[PDB]
């Protein structure tokens, strides 16, 4: 309901799960969206260890400086990518949600400070900004705030709509990954020799009902001279028997 | 740090809430032209107080940031901008009395009458009916009885106003460095600080004396030949080498001899040029017309329309149901919002009209990318020659026959190019002398040159003198018919007119020579000329962050003012009126005058 301002944006994990894209256009399907390193289709099948999404408000024109290598207010003193992310820059309007009439200042983002911000680095200070040689102190000439309201309304151009942005990361480890894509999974033929995979075991042969007794905790069994000769359905959990098909 | 970042932090705090405010009072501004209620009245007074207050309060600490120390031009141009005083510096006593009195002047001018001797109970007003009289009345009893009324009725009790205004803006003027409120206004032109482009006030006047001196040939012509036809139209009332009367010039002042072409024509049988019937035969409307006048300015290459200027921008008559102001106005509110107030109706005047506008909101768009403080015109008549430019290229008759109003089958001949130029001049040739005159004696009586006991005096010379218009009456020193005039009581400059009218002149043929047009200059369409409208927009988006002059020469290649556009514009119509004037005299004599006799 309330995303998080620019400045103050956070950061949410994601991980043990299938990231499913697609449920995104159903809130919303003006999800203009750019990609870095990697392409959305081929991302439907990868796997991650942890995924981080990122959150914050910003003005139609300052969507632009959301990408690596950029430069402006938000990409210095707001939000930064690395030079060498790896993921996608999710964007929509939010012009008839986030704005009010009179002016909606409940959004701020940082305009000066004393030095730029690094990639995914976050800093709510607010010490005001001496400009002047002289020590600063209190409020006054050369005095001024670090943050800036926007004042969202909605009689205002496209170019200072405000646009709900929304960053995914990806991080890969040397620990086992939680998150992978979506997969597919078809039908089941019998007494045919075709080509099966039954959750990465392939082969070929003729697939038929068996009277075999497994254990709850048993997957594929194994005769005298360790071949594979009995699987089961992952998603009727019943007993199928393998039989080479002819030759001679 | 340096003073210059300091600077350049401050003019960044500083223009968000300056473009926020002016949004709020551009918005209450809105709401007020667009529906006169007592809340509307309320919020533009509030916003127009809260817009003083920030000038006021952003004011005097400016000045902590020298501009001996500043590099930058914007950042200079921006503190100069921000570094002005304006009326402030003198006492708050005078400054209260000068307000009053321009309040007071405006008053009395809004609320100029006329009433009939034979009847107290009826009166006339000034634009409904004083107006009309000189528009469409030839008795000339009546003519005089009004010039004589209105001016005893409002110029006598503007006198005293008047004079302690001039003596409190020569103070002002004083205050601030400079010789008189004429120098004040001529220092607008003025340009420092770039090699080749720098302008002094010296070389405006002597700019406009030549230009005047140049015009006064075919002006004097021009004259002679409506005088040979007023000597028909009027008989025994125009004197064949005196001056014209002041009430016989069309209107209450003559500004515009627009008004006398149904008697200057030179060819009435042949038809007047108007595509009127013809857009009510194809039913259009205020949406059709704006709509051709988008696709007329992205055929020149200008940038679209956005949609909240079709949401917001009052097209249509509100009705009665919402009192609204039917003058069409450009309104630039800033964050992307651009609106046109405007009640347009089926006319080719209101096409016309809608055109200027739409180069008005072209302007305010391509000088938005600037920062607030530079969101103007290089000088005060660069917007309306923009707008001006637009309207004559849609007025041609190429224009009008290629978008389908005028018939296939429409012939053009010398004679009706000949009636079309008569008019552009009685339109725009004719208030040229006027309208110097005026600012000379504005200028003069602001400086001093002219005294006291002497104003009306030298007004009616210097009319003689100029525009060649005698009065009938010899009115002393009581009256301040000068000063019943909106321009001149409301504080306003006439040479930005005249400017203007050169601008447009010069920007017409910089775009036809740049579209690659052959042979008569009123016959140049530029319609589908890219080229044009880029080269036009290249510089409209530069806005006042740099001299009048060098965007004048990027256009038509000119640092300074050109008269020549004016005349190859005329040539025609000038030698026409060089071939009919041979039988009459050309010029005016000052002795002659209605009272003589």
């Given amino acids: 309901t309330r995303f998080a301002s620019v400045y103050a944006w956070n950061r949410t994990r994601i991980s043990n799960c299938v990231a499913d894209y697609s449920v995104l256009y159903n809130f919303a399907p003006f999800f203009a969206f750019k990609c870095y390193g990697v392409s959305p289709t081929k991302l439907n099948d990868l796997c991650f260890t942890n995924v981080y999404a990122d959150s914050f408000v910003i003005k139609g024109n300052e969507v632009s400086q959301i990408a690596p290598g950029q430069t402006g207010n938000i990409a210095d003193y707001n939000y930064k990518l690395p030079d060498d992310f790896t993921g996608c820059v999710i964007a929509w309007n939010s012009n008839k949600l986030d704005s009010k009439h009179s ?38 000439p050369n005095c001024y705030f670090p943050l800036q309201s926007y004042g969202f309304r909605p009689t205002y151009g496209v ?18 990954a939680t998150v992978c894509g979506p997969k597919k999974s078809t039908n089941l033929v019998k007494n045919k020799c075709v080509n099966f995979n039954f959750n990465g075991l392939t082969g070929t042969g003729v697939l038929t009902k068996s009277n075999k007794k497994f254990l709850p905790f048993q997957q594929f069994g194994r005769d005298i001279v360790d071949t594979t000769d009995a699987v089961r359905d992952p998603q009727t959990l019943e007993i199928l028997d393998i039989t080479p098909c002819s030759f001679g | 740090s340096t003073i210059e970042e300091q600077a350049k932090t401050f003019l960044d705090k500083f223009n968000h809430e300056a473009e926020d405010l002016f949004y ?29 207050a920030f000038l006021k309060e952003q004011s005097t600490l400016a000045q902590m940031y020298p501009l001996q120390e500043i590099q930058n031009l914007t950042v200079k141009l921006q503190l100069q901008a921000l570094q002005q005083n304006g009326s402030s510096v003198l006492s708050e006593d005078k400054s209260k009395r000068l307000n009053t009195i321009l309040n007071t002047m405006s008053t009395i001018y809004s609320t100029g009458k006329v009433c009939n001797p034979d009847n107290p109970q009826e009166c006339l007003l000034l634009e409904p009916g004083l107006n009309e009289i000189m528009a469409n009345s030839l008795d000339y009893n009546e003519r005089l009885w009004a010039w004589e009324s209105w001016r005893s009725e409002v110029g006598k009790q503007l006198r005293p106003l008047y004079e ?86 069309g209107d209450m002042w003559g500004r515009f001899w627009t008004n006398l072409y149904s008697l200057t024509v030179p060819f009435g049988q042949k038809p007047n040029i108007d595509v009127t019937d013809a857009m009510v035969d194809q039913a259009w409307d205020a949406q059709r017309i704006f709509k051709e006048a988008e696709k007329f300015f992205v055929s020149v290459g200008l940038p679209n329309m956005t949609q909240g200027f079709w949401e917001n921008s009052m097209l ?22 651009f609106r046109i107030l405007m009640c347009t109706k089926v006319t080719m005047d209101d096409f016309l009209t809608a055109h200027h506008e739409m180069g008005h909101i072209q302007y305010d768009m391509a000088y938005a990318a600037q920062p607030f403080l530079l969101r103007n015109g290089a000088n005060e008549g660069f917007h309306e020659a923009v707008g001006e430019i637009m309207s004559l290229s849609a007025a041609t008759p190429k224009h009008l026959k290629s978008i389908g109003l005028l018939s296939p089958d429409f012939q053009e001949d010398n004679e009706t190019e000949i009636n079309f130029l008569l008019k552009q001049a009685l339109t725009i040739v004719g208030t040229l002398p006027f309208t110097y005159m005026l600012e000379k004696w ?33 009115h002393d020193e009581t009256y301040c018919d000068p000063a019943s005039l909106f321009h001149v009581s409301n504080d306003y400059s006439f040479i ?10 010069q920007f017409q043929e910089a775009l036809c020579q740049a579209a690659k047009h052959e042979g008569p200059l009123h016959k140049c369409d530029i319609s589908n000329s890219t080229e044009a409208g880029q080269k036009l927009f290249n510089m409209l988006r530069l806005g006042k962050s740099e001299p009048w002059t060098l965007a004048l020469e990027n256009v038509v290649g000119a640092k300074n003012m050109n008269v020549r556009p004016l005349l190859n514009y005329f040539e025609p119509l000038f030698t026409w009126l060089k071939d009919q004037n041979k039988n009459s005299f050309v010029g005016w004599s000052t002795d002659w005058s209605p009272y003589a006799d």
């Fill in chain 2, 442 to 474: 504005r200028w003069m009586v602001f400086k001093g040159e002219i005294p006291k006991d002497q104003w009306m005096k030298k007004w009616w010379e210097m009319k003689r003198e100029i525009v060649g218009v005698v009065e009938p009456v010899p």
């Fill in chain 2, 24 to 52: 709020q009072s551009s918005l209450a501004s809105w709401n007020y032209n667009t529906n006169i209620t007592e809340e509307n009245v309320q919020n533009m007074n509030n916003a127009g107080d809260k817009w003083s």
């Fill in chain 1, 159 to 176: 170019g200072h709509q405000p646009y709900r942005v929304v960053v995914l990361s990806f991080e890969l480890l040397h620990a086992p």
């Fill in chain 2, 164 to 249: 302690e205004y001039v003596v409190l803006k020569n103070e002002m003027a004083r205050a601030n460095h400079y010789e008189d409120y004429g120098d004040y206004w001529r220092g607008d032109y003025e340009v420092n600080g770039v090699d080749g482009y720098d302008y002094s006030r010296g070389q405006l006047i002597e700019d406009v004396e030549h230009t005047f001196e140049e015009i006064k040939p075919l002006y004097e012509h021009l004259h002679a030949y409506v005088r040979a036809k007023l000597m028909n139209a009027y008989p025994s009332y125009i004197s064949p080498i005196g001056c014209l009367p002041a009430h016989l010039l």
């Fill in chain 2, 496 to 505: 930005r007119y005249y400017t203007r009218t050169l601008y447009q002149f």
């Fill in chain 2, 316 to 337: 249509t008559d509100p009705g009665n149901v919402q009192k609204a102001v039917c003058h069409p106005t450009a309104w630039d509110l800033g964050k992307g919002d």
């Fill in chain 1, 103 to 140: 002016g909606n200042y409940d959004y701020w983002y940082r305009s000066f400070r004393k030095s730029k911000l690094k990639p995914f680095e976050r800093d709510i200070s607010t010490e005001i900004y001496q400009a002047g040689n002289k020590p600063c102190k209190g409020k006054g």
